[model samples]
Structures are given as C-alpha cells and as structure tokens.
Target: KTVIKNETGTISISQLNKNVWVHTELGSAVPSNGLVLNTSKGLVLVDSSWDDKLTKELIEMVEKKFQKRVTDVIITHAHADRIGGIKTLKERGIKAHSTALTAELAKKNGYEEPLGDLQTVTNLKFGNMKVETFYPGKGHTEDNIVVWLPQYNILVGGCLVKSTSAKDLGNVADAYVNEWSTSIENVLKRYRNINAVVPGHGEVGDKGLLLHTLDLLK
Candidate 1:
C-alpha cells in the first residue's frame, strides 16, 4: 500500500512491505498476481506470469529494482494462469518448485515441469525471509498450495481463496467443491493471524478472504 513502483502496459508491481512486493501481469485478457521477495541470498519469486514473454520481463523488472537475479521460484499448481512460465524460469537457470503431483500434472497439461520437490508442508528459508508452502487438501485444483510468510503474516492463497468482491467461485471445473470447505478450514486453523491475503486474482484482503472463500463454497 505504499508505492506503485512499476506500471507497464501488461505488467505492474507494487510494494507490499520493505522486503516484499506484489507483481501483476495481464494474460488471456485477465490479470494475475504473484509475489516478489527481496532477500539477502537473492530474489525469490512465488510464481511467474502467463508465458515466457511476460515472465522474462517480470524477472527483468524485479532484478532491475532489487539489483539481484531471481534465485528460485515456487509454483502453486498446474494451471495456465500459474504455471505458464516454467520454461522461462528453466531457461534462465532459475529453479522452479512445485509439489510432485503438480509436476506430473504440469507435464500432462503440456507445461515444462517444475522441481516438484515440495511436500504437503515445506519450510524454506531465503536469507532472513521464511516461506512455507502448505497443501491444505484440495480446493481450486488437486495440487494447489498456499504460501505462508510468518514474519509478514501474509498468506498467498492463490486461486483457492476468493476475494471479497468476487461474486462466485471463478471456475470450479477442476475444483473440489465437496471438500473445499474443509480445505479452507485448514487454512483458517493453520494461520490465526493474517494481515494480508492474496488470491490468485482480484484484490488483496485480510483473513476475511479465506472466510469468504468458505462462504462461497457453500
């Protein structure tokens, strides 16, 4: 909520805090969200854009701003909106991480495979930043995962959590509606204090965004 640092025709980035920034890109005529983390080791990306073209530029923008090359990236699931830039990351020798299941799905879905090394709950430390990827059952997709930043109290819910302005679930064709509630409950139970929650698309919110997702499930 501090500054709109970069705004391009198809991409924009804004500051979330001293160590974190939210990067957005337009793909398929829709806007998507991801996180850019500044760390002493290097820059860490939560996810890439819709394609290599955008992902390449996004990385350039981030590197230019932080004066550090992206060290690694963690993908949430195997969807075009999320995993479309796996090839870009690989070409640059950057590590793209995802669950094993997500890796299988990405291959089946025709995207380049990510590391697929993360388990249900994996904690990773980048310099002084602590990031944990959690698989809270199934919601948006079978392999969807949410990222937790404990020190910042920020949860990158991906598409599993809905924004408040969302009227209904964006797309449920691949979603687990029957168990979405329980998955959301898992998040609520896992994080007691959330200062910011970012959905796969739409505005950023607080804990209510996860609760709103539960409400949408019903």
Candidate 2:
C-alpha cells in the first residue's frame, strides 16, 4: 500500500482501491482512520477527525490532493473522533449525514449537531457511483454503521470491525460485546463480494479482517 503523509506528517492517506482511500491519524488518545470516496459529484468523507482543527486540516489536504471538494460526510458513530468535525463541515456548507441514534448521541455528548438527514439506511448516488450506508447492528457503539460500495466491492467497516493488529476489542466502554460478534457475522453474510475491508483503525485487509474481528470479540 502506498502511504501519503500529510504536510503535518501526522495524517496518513492510503489508497485501498481505484476510488477508495483510507485516512489515518492519531486522535482521542488512539489511532483513528476514516474512508474517503472519489465520486463524480465530489468527495465523500466517511468520518471526521478528533477535533475541528484536525478535521479542517484533513479536509483541506484531501481537497488539495484529490482535486475534489468535499460535498458530503457520513459519520459512522457519535464518538468525538468520528463526528467532531461537524462544526467545520457546517461552516463550509458541506452536507453531513448519520444514523438517527448517532445524531442524538452526539447531542448528548455535547458536540456539534449532525446534518438533518438521519436514517437507519441511506442510499446515495453520485453519478454512476453508489454508496450504501446502513446500520448492520451495534458493536463499538449503538449508532455504528458501515458504508458499502458495490461498484468497487469495498466495505468501510468503521468501528464495527476490528483490525488484524488488534489484540482485543480496543474499547468496550460503549461496545456491546455480547452482540459484536453477531453483528460482524451479519456483515459477512450481507456482503459477499468485498475485495477490500477498511477498518476504523489499523491496517486494511480483506474479508479475513471480519473473521479476525469475531475472534477478538470471542
């Protein structure tokens, strides 16, 4: 995988496929990674950074490199590292979407509000590219969701799936351990053509990451 480090050298962007990129940086005392998709409309960011400053930097860098303005953002959950950039996004007039539970939890956590369009599943089309955002059940958080790109056969597992380097479930403070495994199993059965799997943090892998996550949960 080719690693493109940001000017600050703190953020790393890695291309997973022709249209999909994974951005990773340190945040909230842990490594955080999110997905970026190059669609005809513009760029679609999966999750935000740990804070507004970092998020702004991330957006600017991405735009500069990709030559695509970020038109929309999809938050996987309500965690600060995942949705803390909503304020910046709002200021830029960029639209953002998340699960209803995620919006509520963000409010409860005292963060900027997510965009108004909340749903359990969101089907977005940008030219010929299609993105399927759906809540496959709870794992790291009650509001966690995954983004599926059928066109590229890619799946952004968000925090719902663990990286292979993970020794155990990273953080269980908000995770449903009892339901985490089952949640991943559902994902495995749901998508049979995933060639690349991007986890919320750590190295990207294939479908083996899903099984590895289940093992970690067990």
Candidate 3:
C-alpha cells in the first residue's frame, strides 16, 4: 500500500487481495478516480486518469504490485480523464469496456473514437467479486454508468457524485437534471448493502456521499 501526492491532489493505492489492487485518485482534472481489480485470470482496471503520465504510472504501479499484465480496462463514464488512457491501454493489448450509455455519452461529448467504443463488457465477475452496472437514467451524462461491486458493496458513481453545495449537477452536457436526481434515488433504493461510494472523481466514501450529491441537485 502506498500514497502519492501532486499539487492538485493525492492518490492512494491499496492491495485488496493477493492480486486485486484499488487505486484512488484524490485530485486533478476531476478526481479521475477508480480501481484496479487483479484476478487470477487477468487484471481489471476501473478508470483512467487524465494525463498520459498519470495513466501510465497507474498502469505500471499495478503491474509492479501484482506482476500481472492488465488484460481489461473499464471506464465508468465518458469523461476524458476517466478514459483518456484508452489508446495507451489498447497498445498493450488491454481491452476497455463500459455500458452502452457510456459509449453514447462519450460520442455525444465529442469523443469521435472514444475508448468506451473499444470496450464491450457491460457486467463482469471474477472469483468472489462481481461488477454490476447502473445506468440510472443519465445525471452527469446521458451515457454515464456506475459500476457496483456486489461483494464489497462499493459503488463507483463516476462524475455522477458531486458535492452537496454544487450550484448545478456539475456538468449537464448530455444529462437530464430532473431525471438525474431520480436516478440517484433509484440507486439508493436498490442497493442497501452499499458500504462505500467511489465517485468518478474525488474521494471514496460512505453512502452518505450519495446524499451529499443529491443535495446538490435538490
């Protein structure tokens, strides 16, 4: 386990299991946060940081810790920082995956050949870890999708999770603001076991994080 700090924010890397590693980004373009789940089969990366240096460092950090090549990458949303490293990962034979909505949002947001386009997996499971996706009807972006780890009860809310005092829902780009609140409410009702909330950008925290975000929309 280790932590690295930059002028904008910090990043925490922790070993979840023998092969699984969780990388949490604190600051930057937009928190650019997510995780890396290393499995016996291969490596699964949740999101990519904004810059090439940060993205490469993140990938290398995982490879060094687990000594396994990253085989798959998952982008929780269409944000550039979250999927900007797709080309880098693709060069290494690592395929990226995301929900159908994510793909649409990526394009709508002007990613002609977005990384989400290269990904196909909507839901993924390995060993005891299961990843379920939530579309929730578009808050941050029309195609945004949050990845839920059933076993750990961790919900990667992506850019969908904003601060309570945010004037707007943050970026409406291709989002439905009214539906956004309902979408979050839907997630709350469906996942009662959610212990930790991993926002697309920012801190990994408790379910109250959802409430904090909801306050912004309300």
Candidate 4:
C-alpha cells in the first residue's frame, strides 16, 4: 500500500510487495500502467510510459528510490503506452525486451524497436525474482503478452486485459476482438492463485478483473 506520487504528480509508483511495484504515468491525459521490479541483479521494468521524457523520468524515479540501475525492460505490446520508451532505454543502455511481433509492430508504429528476443513463452530469472512472459493470443494487439510473477502470485495483464473501470476496449485499431476472449482464457488457464492482476490503465484488482475483461469482450 506504500505509494510515491512524483512531484510532477503525473507519475506514481505503488508497492505491490516488498520488492515489486506498480508504476503508472499519465499519457494523453490518461493513465497507463507498468511494473517496477526491484531485484538483486537490478531492476526489471515492465512497460514504458507514453513518451521518452516520461519514460526517462520513470527510470530516474525508480532507480533513485531503489538505489539500483534499471538493467532490463520488458515491453508488453507495441503501443506507445507500452514501448514508447525504447529509445530512452537504448539511450540509457538498458536492454529492451519484447516479442518479435511486438518489435515489428513497434517499428511500424513509429517507435524505436526493442530487442525482439522474447519467445511466445519466456521464463527469465533476475537474481531472486522469477517471471514468465506469455503471449496468450491476440487481444489488445497482435503481440500482447502478460507477465507472471510466481513469487508474488501476480499477473501483469498489460493492455490486453481491461481495468474494471474501462467502459470498453480502449484501443482496437490493431486489436482482434474475436480473439481477445480466447487470449484472456489462455492466461486464466495458465496461471492460478493470482493474488493481484494489473491492467494497463487502472487500479489493480484480482481475478475478477480478468472476468470483467471477458465480459467486456462479450
């Protein structure tokens, strides 16, 4: 429940656990969500904010707070709210990781390309933190992926899963509405005992958020 709303108030980071945090930043007057993982190796950031300025600010804030460098960044999708900071990350020499499809779409979407090194299901370990990234199927975007923190039993649903506050699928230009539900079902089937589920742009919730997203798809 610990929270740090930056002086600018446009960015905020709240503790998910002792070492995990949910970071949100304002983009286009809307909020977007990401995770800041404090690991023994360093920090593993989930998604970037809307632009490089905010992304750079986010990195500085978390790094200063944790007293650790951001060593790696895992982008959840290709949208600006997700990958807009690839350029800043590259500039900072942090590894920006993403799926091949996401990287491709990022390039097409006019953002810097992240390292398309993540597989459909990739298990990465950083110090004592273990995370798994899975591409359930096309939902918010063709390459949307969710990250699982088994140690904390939390799911980073990203933009593919809607927040309970979301009235509808926020953006669908590259979305597959027909496949969104199946994608979420895959995530629900893959992970169990999820303590907290984070959507891309709202407050965190539990498994009910996933069900709400499914309802939205219907």
lDDT of 4 by residue, 1-218 (tens): 99998898999999989999999999778999999999999999999889999999999999899999999999999888998878999988999999999988888888889999999999999999999999999898889999999989999999988888889887688899999999999999999689999999898999999999999988
Judge candidate 3 against the unseen true structure and give its global Cα lDDT, from 0 to 1.
0.68
The better-scoring model by lDDT among 1 and 3 is 1
Over 1-218, each residue of candidate 3 has an lDDT whose tens digit, in order, gives 44544344455576544444557553343455677786776668888777556777777777776787877777767777677776677677777777656667666766533344423334567655577766676677766677777767777777888643345566676668888888788889878877777666555667887888888776
Residue 71 alpha-carbon offset, candidate 1, angstroms: 0.7
Kindly indicate the candidate among 3 and 4 with the higher lDDT: 4
Q: Give the 10-residue window scoring lowest on summed lDDT in candidate 1.
A: 1-10
For residues 1-218, what per-residue lDDT tens digits would candidate 1 score against the true structure? Answer: 75454456788888889999888889878989989999999999988989888998899888998999899998998998788889989988999999999999999998889999999999999999999999999888999999999999999999998888899998888999988899899999999899999898988889999888888888
* Number of the top lDDT candidate: 4
Q: In model 2, state the lDDT of residue 132.
A: 89
Clashing pairs in 4: none
Q: Rate the local accuracy (lDDT) of all candidates.
A: 0.90, 0.85, 0.68, 0.92
Off by over 4 Å in 2: 116-118
Better of 2 and 3 by TM-score: 2
Error of 1 at 174 (Å): 0.9
- Per candidate, the number of residue pairs that clash is 1, 0, 3, 0
Q: Which segments of model 3 are wrong by more than 4 Å?
A: 1-11, 15-21, 25-30, 107-122, 163-168
| Candidate 3 vs. true structure, TM-score | 0.81
Q: Specify the poorest-scoring 10-residue window by lDDT in model 2.
A: 113-122
